Ligand binder design. Structure first.
Ligand SMILES: Nc1nc2c(ncn2[C@@H]2O[C@H](COP(=O)(O)OP(=O)(O)OP(=O)(O)O)[C@@H](O)[C@H]2O)c(=O)[nH]1
Length: 377
């Protein structure tokens, strides 16, 4: 059997996520702002959770229909054969509802009506006279309404995917965003890579895991691993496969610096937890003094944004100082993410590309500065 899955992502991450899904061998059905819909074989749920670095989670799509009234929402939800997806005794909390530009804007009421519909559907299938028991494993139901089109799905993930298990940290960049940053560059294992304001090390940890082909989900668990409705052998084979795919022969080193000594301590701890401590060296250091004799290196970094009035002036000077230091490097490429709108002006250089991205509550841009190209003829 095949599945239709949906993976939400931050706006601006759709291209990277689509590329990852394509690399897993799956067909993309629909690309929309903040979510990719795709078709997979029976390995799809396990493989998607195991391997996708830019997905915030992996949903199993159950149904899509129009609903302009609560009666219509109820009737359409109830007619779904829920017993096919929710087994006897299973828990089915309606974990979340989102409604955008739709008549059914009250999400808690959407949740209650969907709950009632599913209870009615199951009661009919399971001929349940007494209490419909909900004491076994959990199938969290998600409802998404956009311009009156309702999508109902089941969460296969549980804890948000960005939680790989290594984050034990100030204000770290999201793991999924960090992986997307790496993917937006030409960096490959073996090439010099430095994050000179590395904080708790997220960007470098994500890059190291990409470099040794360590699956993001390798050291965490997923709610669907407990589902009686799945063949447990599939999840098992997918995990074993992922372990075997780790590149154990490759040797490389990438580097992080920060002036916050506690952040370096945390970064080292986090890399050990992630299992990539052998590929990263973290040190206290000042990015404005960064120098190298190597050429053709990469910098990928997340500097302070200077959002507070009290910080704005020092951050502007930092940007100028970074520009000076980075331009003295020999044919390096550098990439910086910041919400500071006028970054290019203070940095002293126009980017090749500027991509709009999101740490959710923050509207950030990724400024890309690939090194000079060879001469023309
Ligand atoms: N090396 C260096 N670090 C600096 C300098 N100025 C500020 N920083 C650090 O640069 C980091 C960039 O800001 P953050 O937003 O905190 O980076 P981060 O939150 O650690 O991002 P993550 O990698 O996900 O943890 C901060 O941890 C600051 O301590 C500097 O002049 N040199």
């Amino acid at each position: 059997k095949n599945y239709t899955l949906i993976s939400p992502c931050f706006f601006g991450m759709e291209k990277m996520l689509a590329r990852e899904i394509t690399n897993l061998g799956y067909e993309i059905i629909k690309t929309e702002d903040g979510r990719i819909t795709y078709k997979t074989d029976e390995f799809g749920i396990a493989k998607s959770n195991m391997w996708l670095r830019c997905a915030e989670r992996v949903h199993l799509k159950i149904a899509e229909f129009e609903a302009k009234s609560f009666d219509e929402l109820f009737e359409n939800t109830k007619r779904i054969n829920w017993s096919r997806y929710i087994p006897y005794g299973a828990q089915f909390p309606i974990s979340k509802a989102s409604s955008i530009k739709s008549k059914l804007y009250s999400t808690p009421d959407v949740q209650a009506i969907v709950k009632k519909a599913i209870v009615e559907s199951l009661k009919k299938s399971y001929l349940e006279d007494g209490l419909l028991k909900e004491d076994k494993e959990k199938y969290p139901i998600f409802v998404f309404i956009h311009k009156d089109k309702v999508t109902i799905s089941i969460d296969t993930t549980g804890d948000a995917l960005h939680k790989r298990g290594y984050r034990e940290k100030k204000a770290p960049i999201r793991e999924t965003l960090a992986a997307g940053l790496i993917y937006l560059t030409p960096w490959k294992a073996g090439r010099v890579l430095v994050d000179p304001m590395c904080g708790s090390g997220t960007i470098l940890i994500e890059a190291a895991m990409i470099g040794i082909n360590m699956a993001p989900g390798l050291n965490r668990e997923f709610i669907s691993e407990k589902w009686r409705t799945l063949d447990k052998k599939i999840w098992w084979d997918v995990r074993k496969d992922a372990f075997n795919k780790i590149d154990n022969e490759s040797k490389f080193k990438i580097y992080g610096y920060d002036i916050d000594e506690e952040s370096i301590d945390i970064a080292r701890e986090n890399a050990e937890i992630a299992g990539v401590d052998e590929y990263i060296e973290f040190n206290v250091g000042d990015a404005t003094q960064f120098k190298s004799e190597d050429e053709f290196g990469f910098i990928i970094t997340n500097p302070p944004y200077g959002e507070r009035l009290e910080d704005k002036d020092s951050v502007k000077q930092l940007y100028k100082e970074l520009g000076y230091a980075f331009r003295k490097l020999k044919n390096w490429s550098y990439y910086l993410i910041t919400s500071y709108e006028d970054f290019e002006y203070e940095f002293g250089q126009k980017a090749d590309k500027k991509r709009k991205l999101y740490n959710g509550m923050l509207k950030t841009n990724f400024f890309q500065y690939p090194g000079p190209k060879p001469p023309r003829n």
